[PDB]
Amino acid sequence: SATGGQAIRNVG
Amino acid sequence: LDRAFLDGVGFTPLAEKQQQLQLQLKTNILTANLIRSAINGMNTESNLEV
């Protein structure tokens, strides 16, 4: 909510 | 007649194609290259009909 976190979808 | 005779199809799955594209296009991840992004959303559910 306070710290945005993104991730790789399927290139992993 | 084509439908009755052309039973199977031959193709390579997506994973290998994505690996080849990654190797040929040596770019860092986390750079938002849309060429790689567009292909990542494909599938081959419908190949026999095509």
Q: What approach was used to elucidate this structure?
A: cryo-EM
Rg of chain B taking only CA atoms, in angstroms? 15
Q: Which residue of A has its CA nearest to B42?
A: A10
Please state, in angstroms and rounded to a whole number, the distance separating the CA atoms of residues B36 and B29: 10
CA distance linking residue B11 with residue A4, whole number of Å: 40
Q: Which residues of A touch B (CB under 8 A)?
A: 8-11
Please list every residue in chain A whose beta carbon sits closer than 8 Å to the beta carbon of residue B22: 11
Q: Would you call B24 exposed, middle or buried from its count of C-beta atoms within 10 A (0-12, 13-18, 19+)?
A: exposed
Residue B40 phi, psi dihedral angles, 5° rounding: -60, -20
- Among B39, B33, B49, B47, which residue's Cα sits nearest to residue B16? B39
The residues, ordered by sequence, that sit 6+ positions from A10 with a Cβ below 8 Å of its Cβ are B40
Looking at residue B40, the DSSP 8-state letter turns out to be T
User: How many CA atoms does the CB half-sphere of A12 hold within 13 Å?
Assistant: 4
Chain B CB contacts of A12 under 8 Å are none
